[PDB]
């Protein structure tokens, strides 16, 4: 496709300029071309939306932290509650765009277990971003949808991936975070992170010389989440 190369050009342009809103619309159009994404175009899509939703996430937590330190009788509370809901609506729509991209294009045209693990991990990720702010009956179902995608990706990666690959290590770290932040279960969060780390150390001979940098960083991230949580 003619514009497919131009869309990867503008995407790389906007990433270097830290214009992730523009970068995410190009990677969205590319995904809407039906064709299964290559490894480069695949990670360009997540980098874009991780910054787009990451700006809303970090802003939401700053606003929600102020609201919890605000007495239920302050006049500024309804304004803080109104501004929080404004951030949530943008945040909710971002994950909505990502999730319908996942189910109508990405997970549908996978045809190999690596991309299934990658895209199912993204499903668990962005449902976790929704569960971070959901409340009521909404919360429990987004939680079950997040755990649903993580467990499937965790089962496929456990039987088709080696514990040293960054994707299995990355999913193990995000799943371990889900068990700590969402389910509020630190004991199982550490054990999931510990065995993923220990299985990667054991099969250190199965690590490909290309994805060495990524795996060394992700294994360190697991050990600090470990070191932090067990105290």
């Amino acid at each position: 496709q003619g514009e497919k190369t131009e869309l990867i050009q503008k995407a790389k342009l906007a990433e270097q300029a830290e214009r992730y809103d523009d970068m995410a619309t190009c990677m969205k159009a590319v995904t809407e071309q039906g064709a299964e994404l290559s490894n480069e175009e695949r990670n360009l899509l997540s980098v874009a939306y991780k910054n787009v939703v990451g700006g809303r996430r970090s802003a939401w937590r700053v606003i929600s932290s102020i609201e919890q330190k605000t007495d239920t009788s302050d006049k500024k509370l309804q304004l803080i509650k109104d501004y929080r809901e404004k951030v949530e609506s943008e945040l909710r729509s971002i994950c909505t765009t990502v999730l319908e991209l996942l189910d109508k294009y990405l997970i549908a045209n996978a045809t190999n277990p690596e991309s299934k693990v990658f895209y199912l991990k993204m499903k668990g990720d962005y449902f976790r971003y929704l569960a971070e702010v959901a409340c009521g009956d909404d919360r429990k179902q987004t939680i079950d949808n997040s755990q649903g995608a993580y467990q499937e990706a965790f089962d496929i990666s456990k039987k088709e991936m080696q514990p040293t690959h960054p994707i299995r290590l990355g999913l193990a770290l995000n799943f371990s975070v889900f068990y700590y932040e969402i389910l509020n279960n630190p004991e199982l969060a550490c054990t999931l992170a510990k065995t993923a780390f220990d299985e990667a150390i054991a099969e250190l001979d199965t690590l490909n010389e290309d994805s060495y940098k990524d795996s060394t960083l992700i294994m360190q991230l697991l050990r600090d989440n470990l070191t932090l949580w067990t105290s």
Binding site: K50, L173, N174, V177, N225, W229
Partner: peptide, 5 residues
Amino acid sequence: TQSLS
């Protein structure tokens, strides 16, 4: 604390 990036 830290998620993947």
